[PDB]
Amino acid sequence: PWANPAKANAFMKCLIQKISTSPVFPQQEKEDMEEIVETMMSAFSSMSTSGGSNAAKLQAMNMAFASSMAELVIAEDADNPDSISIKTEALAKSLQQCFKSTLGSVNRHFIAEIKDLIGMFAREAA
Amino acid sequence: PWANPAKANAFMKCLIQKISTSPVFPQQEKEDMEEIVETMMSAFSSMSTSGGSNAAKLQAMNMAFASSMAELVIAEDADNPDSISIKTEALAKSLQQCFKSTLGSVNRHFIAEIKDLIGMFAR
């Protein structure tokens, strides 16, 4: 995944541009996805050595970022499993494009865990 | 869950005290868990209540806080996955008493979610 704050920050700014410019998500989702990832990037700065190694911490902080986006897609459209499916692809593609415009290679390890987080979080509502 | 700032600080102080006093957790994980729970709870205090932390924004942070503790346990399986239930039940206990001592009852949902989160993060 990411490590340097210069990479995680530019990843969020790309993501906040892809999300806010995505008509798939209603305005209630565009600003909630805004503050959710904005509260995360402010946290990926208050680390142990800030932009440092962390490992366990950086890993856990990545699953917090993934679960926050995974649940947000679920919690805002749990009534319709169809919208959940189309917004998962609209979110995942916005991720993959930002992995390319900041790193140059998509790491499916973080994207597959999101689709596994969305898949599990969907059934917990059932 | 720990939306409003007052509720979040009491749960934070309880959790940090329960993790530091636990013998199951090693020395390093007590530190990394403290950083994650202080980092996560400061995110809850930025919005809080039901207006700033709406249901969608709250439930996202809840599982974010649940996954941050779940993966931290999953990552530091330095004793091997062979024995991670001891750290799962210990985190489950520490959450149950902090639930009762700061909110009145226990939330069997947020507890079993961590069980699902730890279980799925294992594979």
Chain A residue numbers with beta carbons less than 8 Å from the beta carbon of B36 are: 57, 60-61, 64
In CATH terms, the fold of domain B5-122 is: Enzyme I; Chain A, domain 2 (1.10.274)
Q: How was this structure determined?
A: X-ray
Query: In whole angstroms, what is the distance from residue B120 CA to residue A123 CA?
Result: 13
N residues, chain B: 123
Tokens of B27: 């020395």
- Tell me if B50 sits within 8 A of B76, measured CB to CB: no
Query: In whole angstroms, what is the distance from residue A13 CA to residue B99 CA?
Result: 36
Distance in Å, alpha carbon of B80 to nearest chain A alpha carbon: 14
- The residue among B65, B56, B60, B45 whose CA lies nearest residue B114 is B65
Query: In whole angstroms, what is the distance from residue A52 CA to residue A58 CA?
Result: 9
Q: For the CA atoms of chain A, what is the radius of gyration? A: 14
Instruction: Give the CATH number of domain A5-124.
Output: 1.10.274.70
Does B32 reach chain A within 8 Å, measured CB to CB? yes
Please state the separation of Cα A12 from the chain's center in Å.
8
At a CB cut-off of 8 Å and minimum separation 6, what does B10 contact?
B102
Inspect the interface and report whether the beta carbons of A60 and B116 lie closer than 8 Å.
no
A-chain residue closest to B113, CA distance:
A124
Query: In whole angstroms, what is the distance from residue A104 CA to residue B55 CA?
Result: 35
Query: In whole angstroms, what is the distance from residue A73 CA to residue A91 CA?
Result: 9
Query: In whole angstroms, what is the distance from residue A34 CA to residue A46 CA?
Result: 19
Does B34 reach chain A within 8 Å, measured CB to CB? no
- Tell me if B88 sits within 8 A of B25, measured CB to CB: no
- The residue among B78, B75, B48 whose CA lies nearest residue B61 is B48
Tokens of B40: 């996560």
Burial, A37: exposed, middle or buried (Cβ in 10 Å; 0-12, 13-18, 19+)? buried
CA atoms within 13 A on the CB side of B97: 12
Chain A and chain B share a number of CB contacts under 8 A equal to: 103
Q: Resolution in angstroms, to 1 decimal, for this deposition?
A: 3.0
A-chain residue closest to B116, CA distance:
A120
Please report, for chain A, the start and end positions of each structural domain, with discontinuous segments joined by +: 5-124
Burial, B5: exposed, middle or buried (Cβ in 10 Å; 0-12, 13-18, 19+)? middle
Inspect the interface and report whether the beta carbons of B68 and A56 lie closer than 8 Å.
no
**What single-letter DSSP state applies at residue B105?**
S
Dump the DSSP string for A15-80. HHHHHHT-TTS-HHHHHHHHHHHHHHHTTTTSSSSSSS--THHHHHHHHHHHHHHHHHHHHTTTT-
- Tell me if A110 sits within 8 A of A1, measured CB to CB: yes
